[PDB]
Design a protein that fits this description.
This is part of a larger assembly, with 2 copies of chain A, 1 copy of chain B and 2 copies of chain C.
Chain A (H helix, E strand, L loop, with lengths): L2 E7 L1 H17 L23 E2 L7 E2 L1 E5 L5 H6 L12 E2 L8 H24 L5 E9 L4 H14 L6 E7 L11 H12 L5 E5 L1 H12 L6 H20 L10 H4 L7 E3 L2 E3 L14 H6 L21 E7 L4 H13 L12 E6 L8 E7 L5 H12 L9 H4 L5 H22 L3
Parallel strand pairs in A: 1-4, 1-6, 4-5, 6-7, 7-8, 8-9, 11-12
Antiparallel strand pairs in A: 2-3, 10-13, 11-13
Helix pairs in contact in A: 1-7, 3-4, 4-5, 5-11, 5-13, 11-13
Chain B lengths: L4 H12 L16 H4 L18 H9 L1 H8 L7 H4 L8 H7 L14 H4 L5
Chain C lengths: L5 E3 L1 H17 L20 E3 L5 E3 L3 E2 L7 H5 L11 E2 L9 H4 L8 H11 L9 E4 L6 H17 L4 E6 L13 H4 L11 E5 L1 H10 L8 H19 L9 H6 L13 E3 L4 H4 L6 H8 L16 E10 L3 H11 L15 E6 L16 E9 L3 H14 L7 H4 L6 H21 L4
Parallel strand pairs in C: 1-6, 4-5, 6-7, 7-8, 10-11
Antiparallel strand pairs in C: 2-3, 9-12, 10-12
The complex binds guanosine-5'-triphosphate (2 copies) and guanosine-5'-diphosphate (2 copies).
One guanosine-5'-diphosphate binds next to helix 1, helix 4 and helix 7 of chain A.
Subcellular location (chain B): Cytoplasm, Cytoskeleton
Subunit structure (chain B): Interacts with tea2.
Family (chain B): Belongs to the MAPRE family.
Chain lengths: 428, 121, 434, 428, 434
């Protein structure tokens, strides 16, 4: 019944579970205890996606929370929601990853990979029909950046028809975590592009701009940060997980987007407001569409005004027509006609879902494609290569088992990406 | 300084003449003991089994080196139980370490253990 | 369980731990008799518990005097340790490297090395081990350099951190501090993974201004170094926000295997009346941690350019006030450049508030910062030594009392030579072109 | 009425009684006092198997607990359940066995064999119709390994039609008891193969893996060890001892298994979980079947992945269909088709029993055959022969009455077994 | 009822039992007057009870002095024995084998052999009998070797265990310990089924470190040997988990009828303050029982390879912590090989907790280990004797006082010869090839 098995990796790659799973329970009317409490009968017919049925209504979240160090793993165990996940799927090593890629990709995950795949296999064939797999991790760290990629390439070597879809979070332009965060980003992209289809890129610093610019809070914390970018994992399945009028799926959101095997694009929300900014509007699709236009409601630290929109899919939920979107999309595609790609007339995808979220009459989820995602990788590439000139921190990788020229290959892998996005910025 | 998998695998394919696909067969072995016969020449090859993919049985084959390390005296502890797991985190820095032994002790000549163990019969 | 053990050699290494473990016992609710309690994993972090409920501080003590060690069993921590771990020496010839190394200190080693062994036989999650000594010591400089060179000979890949303390630019504690200190950076060069060093006269300089006490003592300097320890170690022993491992430092501080001498900067260190009439926000602290008034080592880190620096924050911290602060340091002229890392930072967040010991005149605070700074200037105290040490050796002053204890002067011939490559290494990193 | 008389031998060979007999009473609704307390009327029509009827409802367990030393014999006497067995059948010698085989097989049991057979004869002809005899003992020790075999060969020389079925426990690959445990194992197999039909092999060390790997207890004791492997003695008679839909018997489980007179195969349970791992599942046949696949739910310290399945019988109890097993057995016989033996298409035996056990809605008992049970005996044989090269500990056997070349014969007896399992590993 | 009797010859054999039976009376709730009690079979194990409720310790005492024996009737156990069993000798010429064997000690034998007889006339389940003597004794070495050779001549197949004690590598108690000790291993070679021997100077070496008492005595050494006795005997007198018989040892320690000299290793032996600040788990003990610090016999069992070793555990023990420990010993380099048994162990479990006598400075523990280790090294104290004894015989020193008591030197001609085959036997087992 078109279902997904969930995979996390890394510390903050595991932190996103609670913003995900407590929402998707609340989106499906489900408590902390797992037992059922839902209002409408609308929220059942596609409930089977992110949940395996249980004895006595428990409705276990199909997930495997994976990490290399037991620091933050007990935190969601010993905290609340300690009875949602089944601890057979909680696995974690003890020795530190040191957030070094090949330590996390090549060798210490290989201590734990043998326990990984026997977990997800018996999860896979107990499902009816897999729709796909989700990988949420980091680009910057080591555990999520390294171990999930080796974890990915085995799964893509087992299920070549099944779709592989990934979420990940970006290195920052300014607010970076560590100094090998250039190396981890390049090495992560070497496996994402080759194995999985689609990956999205979320700057924490641009996420920090959101509550700064839009919601006006001087001091949010990460439990507000993941709480916001949670709902796009809700939003991509919003179309899917309960009925509507039109909606399609992530594989149908895969083939429509890109004319090539080269899949990266953007994320945004609609609507969005502050505390006191709530009631002073008229929340509607013209209110929705303009928070689906700015870079300020995006996640990528790159300018669509520097870029060009390849393809757009829009995912609405609530009482919403088409012509309220039609007349409004036409109102903004005309003034911004040079912002579209002339390879495709009408690269707009419309999808209308039924029920609203909590306390909001409408909601929309943004998917727009760009040429300026190279503005990440050009900002990455010279951030990468300048730390290769003196072979910066090289012995913490070649002192673990990887040839240095294998690291040089991923540069051209990044440059193979940019070489295409060099063209469709200005060609045709 | 250190060596990756890329050079070392055909490097250990060289001096042993073995069909070593991945390094984790040194999780069993068959090559680490074939490092030392390239110097010391006294190692009784008929003391190890050859097929022996049966980890509970394999633990005999780790200790055969503990006579070899006895008679020549290199004081590294060998903990065979995670070594015998055919898993990494010990086997690399056991063979990164045995090519720290590559430094001075070669007389340069070849040592055909492919012909010495009876063509692995 | 991600556990690590701390050795204590040298009379400095005695009294340093007497502040470190005091902080350790207060940072877990441990009664001073060992029998505690007048997080979950936290209650068994540094401690291999017995079923009686009291527990052993996973340490060791090494000294060749029975003098200062037996003060502990006289002192109030008489039930904390156990009289196997606390190995003394019956006689001593300290300020004498090459018999504390090669004659008299070596007779303790086989007794020492056994006690390293069984404490490594319970700590299943082992993260290397921690080393305390001094350069102003003879034997702590002596046996300490000998202590690393067999342990790293045994333990191979395991982590080797040490917090050292070196003789000041202005005030010595002994004349041998050219001699029986500057050679010990040979053995600790290629046996310490990373290392850290600090000045008394710089730490005293903080005491007259930021602590404002005319006549401090060692103990107050002991308490100040000790929180830097728990800022690194016990941060992974507490469930923070962005956790920082011990292994992360040694891969986020060295581009090259030699260059492992960072700074220490700890802040806020604020006196009693000074905390009042003052709000120390997080950027109020980080603007102090780049100013030389809270600086641990009497050097010129202003003049040199910074290389790479990890930071550790305690208490109630947001990353937005980090990035609002740290984007102002990189803008400011008081740093100019890194060439080899266009970011040059590592940020780490733990929630545990700064522990405030009752006795000393330090004041309580709700947020903390620890700073480990690599620079292009820290080799000048080394160059102070080269100005000093090459002058003593320009007279051959008790070479006999380096010879008669059993070592020729070939290492003294090697002494400035390895030092010369250290000076050569910072100008090598000082090369910043195309 | 198709009934069994029970025989134990050795210390731990007598320890298994309490895990057996307190369960089979509880499986039949029967107290410590012997007098009847049962809920359903379902548990009577085949109650006569392991019990001789008594005066006043006492319902004596038909058993003879046999040992050579009075150490552990009083322990279950002076402990609880001291009024279940009748003490006429409690026999035991006083002089030590020294756990040496021919001391226990050939000579000291011959002090007690004359009292043995006059016990079991009057037990035999007082039964209606014997279904068979159970021998539970050790391979490693002396009393159970030696005295029961001489006890067996007299019974097989008295009742050639009656089936002889044995349970025994293995020498360990690593956690061995004594050093003559190689000799006792070889000498025990010389009588098991020649006289009785079937014997099963249970490693304590692999049993120690079960609570280690699956149930997650750091420190179980033997009263948890026998408590687990008890229920397969319940499980082999689960089909038999109360009604169902299809079920067959151990003689029908004998002729279906092996195409030769060479009978050894494996043991496992289903389901199985930890303390907190209980309610987080959906206990069903797909939950049952996958704990009927791994080596981790087996007992033998040998790899079925190194081996090949000759024949399989499955024994379910609970509400269970066939198609829930059919579609699931077909789901695993296809992916693991090379793991089956191509001499026989569809070597699967299905048997469905009715009532569930205590507090579990379903239960299954595993019977699968292997080629890699030679991985025991090859591990035995070179463990055997290397202690023959110097005639190790030889005077504690030839100093008791057995020729040394008689000991050499059992080597070829082991090698006669392996010579066949050499073939069907890879032939046909 | 699986019962056995313990003879006591020699002044060592006097005082050894004065710790053994003291432990025996405390391990069953026996008042010191014999009239007890201020398991089921346990209450009548070593003891042929009378209906009065007091009961005889099934022992005997053999000495040719009235000196130390009459200390018992002066001492507090004056009602324990009975004055038939306690057979003395009116005169003595000790340190003189061949009149304690052949002249003066033989006059007691017919009185002794009767008292062996009637005590064998109640113990229906007889498991051989137990022998205590010394090598440092004359007559205990003298009459003791004579004691076995008629009893094993009588009793044939019956079990013959002895706990001996031999003159140290460094400190003798008499000069005759080359002479009137090393010959007694003739008669006890082919009359003792198994045997065991222990060193004072090794047991004293434990006292200065693991007991930490500067001036111990015999009595403390007597208490330490005594628990090894009850670790073997009373383990079958208590309903354990995997019971171990007396007969199991003599078939699980010798591949060949000569090689019956194992080690003893008892652990934990832990001083008073040492038990505190310490958790001694079971693998914490077994990692000590292979280290030479708890080693009973001053030899080099590290260098030699181990042959076969039975272990006995007391108290609260799981076999999983056995197999987690014992798989680490066989992995570890500190043993290398057996060739003749690829397992080389025998594991045995009894539930009875370790008995803790009040007076001495030993500390209480909730788990115990006894170790009986056969090796390829224990013949070196025998080779110490061959270095010693062949030198005395290279001068013929009071051969007259071996002759004049009534024996020619043909056994001294045989003395090193049987010793030479013992040395030849360990290199014979030292042969490890194809
Ligand atoms: N105890 C102590 N020593 C300090 C402190 N600060 C600096 N030191 C230095 O530590 C050195 C102590 O070692 P020693 O003076 O040689 O005393 P010791 O017992 O002989 O030390 P060893 O040479 O190692 O035996 C002194 O030279 C001081 O310079 C401190 O706060 N406490
Ligand atoms: N009584 C006693 N003797 C010990 C002890 N430990 C060692 N010994 C030795 O036991 C020997 C005692 O026997 P003897 O010295 O000859 O005293 P004795 O009465 O003449 O003994 P016999 O020769 O058998 O008559 C001494 O040589 C000591 O070496 C102990 O703890 N108690
Ligand atoms: N999703 C998310 N990522 C974060 C947050 N805070 C920091 N990060 C990034 O997540 C990673 C945290 O590092 P870590 O999880 O330890 O890397 P790991 O080695 O893969 O576990 C770093 O790359 C941070 O830049 C957060 O709140 N949410
Ligand atoms: N069934 C069972 N066997 C055990 C257990 N513990 C040990 N064993 C084995 O059972 C035998 C115990 O020896 P023992 O019963 O005295 O042998 P016996 O001479 O035949 O009585 C040994 O071979 C042990 O390996 C247990 O808990 N259950």
């Amino acid at each position: 019944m078109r279902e997904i098995v969930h995979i996390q990796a890394g510390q903050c790659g595991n932190q996103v579970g609670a913003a995900f799973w407590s929402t998707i329970a609340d989106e499906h009317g489900l408590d902390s205890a797992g037992i059922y409490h839902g209002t409408s009968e609308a929220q059942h017919e596609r409930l089977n996606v992110y949940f395996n049925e249980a004895a006595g209504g428990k409705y276990v979240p199909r997930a495997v929370l994976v990490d290399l160090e037991p620091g933050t793993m007990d935190a969601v165990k010993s905290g609340k929601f300690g009875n949602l996940f089944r601890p057979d799927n909680i696995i974690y090593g003890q020795s530190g990853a040191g957030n070094i890629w090949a330590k996390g990709h090549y060798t210490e995950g290989a201590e734990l990979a043998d326990a990984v795949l026997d977990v997800v296999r018996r999860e896979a064939e107990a499902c009816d029909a897999l729709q796909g797999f989700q990988l949420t991790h980091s680009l910057g760290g080591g555990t999520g950046s390294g171990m999930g990629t080796l974890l990915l390439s085995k799964i893509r070597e087992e299920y070549p028809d099944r779709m592989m879809a990934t979420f990940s979070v970006a290195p920052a332009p300014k607010s970076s975590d560590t100094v090998v965060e250039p190396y981890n980003a390049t090495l992560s992209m070497h496996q994402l592009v080759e194995n999985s289809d689609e990956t999205f890129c979320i700057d924490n610093e641009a996420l920090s701009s959101i509550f700064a610019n839009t919601l006006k809070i001087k001091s949010p914390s990460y439990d507000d940060l993941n709480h916001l970018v949670s709902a796009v994992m809700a939003g991509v399945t919003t179309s899917f997980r309960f009925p509507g009028e039109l909606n399609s799926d992530l594989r149908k959101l895969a083939v429509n987007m890109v004319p090539f095997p080269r899949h990266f694009f953007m994320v945004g929300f609609a609507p969005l407001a502050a505390i006191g900014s709530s009631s002073f509007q008229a929340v509607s699709v013209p209110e929705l569409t303009q928070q689906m236009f700015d870079a300020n409601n995006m996640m990528v630290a790159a300018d669509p005004r520097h870029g060009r929109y390849l393809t757009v899919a829009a995912l609405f939920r609530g009482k919403v027509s088409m012509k309220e979107v039609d007349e409004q999309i036409r109102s903004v595609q005309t003034k911004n006609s040079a912002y579209f790609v002339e390879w495709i007339p009408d690269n707009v995808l419309k999808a209308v879902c039924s029920v609203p979220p909590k306390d909001l009459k409408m909601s929309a989820t943004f998917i727009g494609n760009s040429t300026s995602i190279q503005e990440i990788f050009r900002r990455l590439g010279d951030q990468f290569s300048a730390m290769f000139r003196r072979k910066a921190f090289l012995h913490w990788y070649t002192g673990e088992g990887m040839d240095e020229m294998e690291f040089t290959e991923a540069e051209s892998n990044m440059n193979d990406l940019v070489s295409e996005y060099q063209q469709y910025q200005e060609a045709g | 300084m250190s060596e990756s998998r890329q050079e070392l695998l055909a490097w250990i394919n060289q001096v042993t003449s073995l069909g070593l696909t991945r390094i984790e067969d040194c999780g069993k072995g068959y090559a680490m003991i074939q490092i030392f016969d390239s110097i010391y020449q006294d190692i009784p090859l008929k003391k190890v089994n050859f097929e022996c993919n049966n980890e509970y049985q394999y633990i005999n084959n780790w200790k055969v080196l503990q006579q070899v390390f006895l008679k020549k005296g290199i004081d590294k502890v060998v903990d065979p139980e995670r070594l015998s797991r055919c898993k990494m985190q010990d086997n690399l820095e056991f063979v990164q370490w045995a090519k720290r032994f590559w430094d001075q002790y070669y007389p340069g000549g070849d040592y055909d253990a492919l012909a010495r163990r009876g063509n692995r019969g | 369980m991600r556990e690590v053990i701390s050795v204590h050699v040298g009379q400095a290494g005695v009294q340093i731990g007497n502040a470190c473990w005091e902080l350790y016992c207060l940072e877990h609710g441990i009664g001073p008799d060992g029998f505690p309690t007048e997080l979950n994993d936290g209650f068994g972090t540094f401690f291999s518990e017995t079923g009686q409920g009291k527990f052993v501080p996973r340490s060791i003590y090494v000294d060749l005097e029975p003098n200062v060690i037996d003060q502990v069993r006289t002192g109030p921590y008489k039930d904390l340790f156990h009289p196997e771990q606390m190995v003394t020496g019956k006689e001593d010839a300290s300020n004498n490297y090459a018999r504390g190394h090669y004659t008299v200190g070596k007779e303790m080693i086989d007794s020492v090395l056994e006690r390293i062994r069984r404490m490594a036989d319970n700590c299943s999650g082992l993260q290397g081990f921690l080393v305390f000594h001094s350069f102003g010591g003879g034997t702590g400089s002596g046996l300490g350099a000998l202590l690393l060179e067999r342990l790293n000979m045994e333990y191979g890949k395991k982590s080797n951190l040490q917090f050292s303390v070196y003789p000041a630019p202005q005030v010595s504690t002994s004349v041998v501090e050219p001699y029986n200190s500057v050679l010990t950076t040979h053995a600790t060069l290629d046996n310490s993974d990373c290392t850290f060093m600090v000045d008394n006269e710089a730490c005293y300089d903080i005491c007259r201004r930021n602590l404002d006490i005319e006549r401090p003592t060692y103990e107050n300097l002991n308490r100040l170094i000790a929180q830097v320890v728990s800022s690194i170690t016990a941060s992974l022993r507490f469930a923070g926000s962005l956790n920082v491992d011990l292994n992360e430092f040694q891969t986020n501080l060295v581009p090259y295997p030699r260059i492992h001498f960072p700074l220490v900067t700890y802040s806020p260190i604020v006196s009693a009346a000074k905390a009042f009439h003052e709000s120390n926000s997080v950027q109020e602290i980080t603007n102090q941690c780049f100013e030389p008034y809270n600086q641990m080592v009497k050097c010129d880190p202003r003049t040199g350019r910074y290389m790479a620096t990890c930071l550790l924050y305690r208490g109630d911290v947001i990353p937005r006030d980090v990035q609002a602060a740290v984007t102002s340091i990189k803008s400011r002229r008081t740093i100019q450049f890194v060439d080899w890392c266009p970011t040059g930072f590592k940020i780490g967040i733990c929630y545990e508030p700064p522990q405030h010991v009752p006795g000393s005149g330090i004041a309580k605070v709700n947020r903390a910062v620890c700073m480990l700074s690599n620079t292009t200037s820290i080799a000048e105290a080394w160059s102070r030594l080269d100005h000093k040490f090459d002058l003593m050796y320009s007279k051959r002053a008790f070479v006999h009392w380096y010879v008669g204890e059993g070592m020729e002067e070939g290492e003294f011939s090697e002494a400035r030579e390895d030092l010369a490559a250290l000076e050569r290494d910072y100008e090598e990193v000082g090369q910043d072109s195309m």
